[PDB]
Amino acid sequence: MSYSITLRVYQTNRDRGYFSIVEKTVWHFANGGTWSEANGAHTLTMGGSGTSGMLRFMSTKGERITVAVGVHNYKRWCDVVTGLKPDETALVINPQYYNNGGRDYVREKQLAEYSVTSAIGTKVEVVYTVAEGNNLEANVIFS
Amino acid sequence: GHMSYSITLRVYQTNRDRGYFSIVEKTVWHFANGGTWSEANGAHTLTMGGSGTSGMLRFMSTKGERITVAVGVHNYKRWCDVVTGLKPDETALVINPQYYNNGGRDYVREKQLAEYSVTSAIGTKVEVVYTVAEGNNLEANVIFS
Amino acid sequence: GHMSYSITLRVYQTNRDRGYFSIVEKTVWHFANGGTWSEANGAHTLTMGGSGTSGMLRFMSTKGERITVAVGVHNYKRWCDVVTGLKPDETALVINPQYYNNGGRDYVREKQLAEYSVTSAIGTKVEVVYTVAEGNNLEANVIFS
Amino acid sequence: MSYSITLRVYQTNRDRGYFSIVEKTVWHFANGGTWSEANGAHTLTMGGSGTSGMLRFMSTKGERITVAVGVHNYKRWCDVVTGLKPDETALVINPQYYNNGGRDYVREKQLAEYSVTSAIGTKVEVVYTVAEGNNLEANVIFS
Numbered sequence: 001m002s003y004s005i006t007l008r009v010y011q012t013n014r015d016r017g018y019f020s021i022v023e024k025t026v027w028h029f030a031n032g033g034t035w036s037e038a039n040g041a042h043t044l045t046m047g048g049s050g051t052s053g054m055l056r057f058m059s060t061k062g063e064r065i066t067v068a069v070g071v072h073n074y075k076r077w078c079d080v081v082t083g084l085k086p087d088e089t090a091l092v093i094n095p096q097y098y099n100n101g102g103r104d105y106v107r108e109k110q111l112a113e114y115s116v117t118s119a120i121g122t123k124v125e126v127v128y129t130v131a132e133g134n135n136l137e138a139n140v141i142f143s
Numbered sequence: 144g145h146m147s148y149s150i151t152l153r154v155y156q157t158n159r160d161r162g163y164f165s166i167v168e169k170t171v172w173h174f175a176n177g178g179t180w181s182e183a184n185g186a187h188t189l190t191m192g193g194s195g196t197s198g199m200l201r202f203m204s205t206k207g208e209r210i211t212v213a214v215g216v217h218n219y220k221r222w223c224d225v226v227t228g229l230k231p232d233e234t235a236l237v238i239n240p241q242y243y244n245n246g247g248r249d250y251v252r253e254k255q256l257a258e259y260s261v262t263s264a265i266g267t268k269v270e271v272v273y274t275v276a277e278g279n280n281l282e283a284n285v286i287f288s
Numbered sequence: 289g290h291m292s293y294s295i296t297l298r299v300y301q302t303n304r305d306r307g308y309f310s311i312v313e314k315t316v317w318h319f320a321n322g323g324t325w326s327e328a329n330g331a332h333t334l335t336m337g338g339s340g341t342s343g344m345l346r347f348m349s350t351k352g353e354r355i356t357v358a359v360g361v362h363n364y365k366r367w368c369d370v371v372t373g374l375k376p377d378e379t380a381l382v383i384n385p386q387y388y389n390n391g392g393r394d395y396v397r398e399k400q401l402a403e404y405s406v407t408s409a410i411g412t413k414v415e416v417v418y419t420v421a422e423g424n425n426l427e428a429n430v431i432f433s
Numbered sequence: 434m435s436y437s438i439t440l441r442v443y444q445t446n447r448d449r450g451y452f453s454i455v456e457k458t459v460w461h462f463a464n465g466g467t468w469s470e471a472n473g474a475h476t477l478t479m480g481g482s483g484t485s486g487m488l489r490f491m492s493t494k495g496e497r498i499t500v501a502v503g504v505h506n507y508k509r510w511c512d513v514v515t516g517l518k519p520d521e522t523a524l525v526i527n528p529q530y531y532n533n534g535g536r537d538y539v540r541e542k543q544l545a546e547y548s549v550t551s552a553i554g555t556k557v558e559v560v561y562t563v564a565e566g567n568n569l570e571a572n573v574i575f576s
Contacts, residue, residue: 008451010444010445010447011443011444011445012443012444014443014560014572014574018441018473018474019473020181020472020473021180021473022171022179022181023169023170023171023179024168025170025234025235025236026167026168026234026235026236027234027236028233028234028236028237029232030232031231031232032230032231032232032233032234033231033234034167034168034201035166036165036167036329037327037328037329038326038327038328038329039326039327039328039453040451040452040453040454041451056179058179085177086176086177086192087173087174087175087176087192088177089170089171089172089173089177089178090170090236091170091171091172091236091240094236127447139447141447155301155302155304156300156301156302157301157302159300159419159429163298163331164330165330166330181471181472182470182471182472183469183472184350184469184470184471185308185309185310185311274304284304311468312459312468312469313457313458313459313467313468314456314457315456315458315522315524316455316456316524317522317524318520318521318522318524318525319520320520321519321520322518322519322520322522323519323522324455324456324489324491325454325455325456326453337519337520346467348467375465376464376466376480377461377462377463377464377465378465379458379459379460379461379466381458381459381460381461381523381524381527381528382461384524385524
């Protein structure tokens with residue numbers, strides 16, 4: 001069966017910079033997948049369990065952050081990476097979750113929520129609001 | 144510092160028989176300090192940190208046809224390529240690296256083409272044509288027919 | 289309650305000589321409990337609270353040409369119209385009401401057209417063609433050429 | 434001289450519903466104007482001083498709200514109207530600021546900020562971050 005993850009973005013802090021998506025990737029396991037946009041939300045559709053995709057964001061102050069979401073052994077997972085250099089594109093980071101690329105262990109945690117504060121003080125949270133089944137939903141919150 | 148390059152793409156869809164294409168993935172290669180995609184006035188701009196990198200848009204139609212368009216700058220001149228007939232697992236993340244490190248598509252990048260045309264096995268024609276083909280603020284049309 | 293109607297529009301731009309059109313305004317008329325525009329998969333959907341209302345997209349090209357497309361449902365059947373040659377102050381807010389209350393364009397609404405074609409004075413052709421022309425979930429192509 | 438107003442939307446409350454734009458209008462004085470979208474912001478460009486435009490938003494919980502922005506006698510103005518019925522479209526509300534339509538006095542205040550809490554508890558703020566000149570900028574904040 002196919003899986004989808006639908007993300008809505010909440011930006012809450014008017015002092016730390018405004019974020020926009022600068023890249024969207026899909027990993028090639030499980031027959032791949034695609035991003036789409038509807039009603040102000042972003043949906044990743046995947047061919048089955050065992051793959052993922054990523055949104056990279058950049059702020060008006062030049063801060064670069066990636067959000068990864070996917071399904072591992074039929075359960076959702078997520079991660080956020082901050083403090084990225086300009087050349088650390090999503091194309092670089094998304095593969096790091098597979099083939100013992102350094103971040104596999106995070107995917108294997110199957111997290112339904114994750115939060116981190118960047119070194120320059122930006123907090124990012126991913127929280128699944130629908131955390132079971134094939135039509136998953138999560139909020140991405142910048143603060 | 145290094146000179147930055149931007150490529151701005153506008154999409155023309157002309158043939159209802161091909162179904163309707165939408166973007167399903169946007170990648171940026173990591174050479175030359177990377178880069179970012181942005182959207183404005185219905186156009187898509189890839190901004191890059193220097194000559195020697197690229198990015199890709201993958202499209203999928205309402206009929207399930209998957210096609211990638213790659214654009215970049217090689218030795219200070221624009222390049223482009225179109226790949227059709229893609230399998231569901233042949234994502235832009237798979238294809239974009241193939242232009243580098245002798246990955247199978249370096250040759251077309253090295254041609255520094257200002258236009259590219261191909262017809263897919265199922266009859267969809269795709270053209271990339273640069274309308275501003277020189278300098279640091281490049282512009283091209285992507286045409287489905 | 290009342291039956292709702294939706295109209296989903298996809299835009300095809302085919303001729304680079306016309307410049308490139310983008311949406312500059314989106315309106316909804318207030319009869320039949322109003323309605324809303326939404327965007328998904330690169331298509332534009334007008335959802336309405338009943339038969340007897342409409343909405344409009346106004347487009348402007350990179351060459352400054354302004355054109356409106358109106359779609360709605362009249363007596364349970366779809367309708368459409370295209371107005372070209374618009375002055376800068378002839379916004380969709382001015383034009384959408386003209387289809388009602390004997391405002392000058394009621395006649396075309398009452399025709400319940402499933403297709404419309406016009407060529408502007410400066411040579412831009414615009415077509416609206418419904419591909420799903422019956423029922424409550426209607427679909428049309430808007431074609432610039 | 435032409436005027437522009439660029440708006441960025443901040444949604445901060447994950448419990449009260451997610452908003453999206455459902456209508457965008459431009460008033461016909463001062464040679465009219467146009468909306469555009471870039472970098473996740475919304476820009477209203479106007480032919481001169483003396484006109485305005487509006488964004489209408491609807492939440493996932495069915496709440497309908499309009500935000501009006503414009504320039505009156507060379508100074509920015511704004512307003513927010515909440516508790517709207519489905520048939521109170523932007524096409525209905527935008528004209529109410531002119532021709533003694535009931536809301537002219539709000540436009541004439543030339544506000545650089547405005548906030549209101551709807552009857553069902555949603556707070557909306559418009560705050561100009563660039564409040565002078567021809568290239569104005571404001572945040573629209575839902576909370």
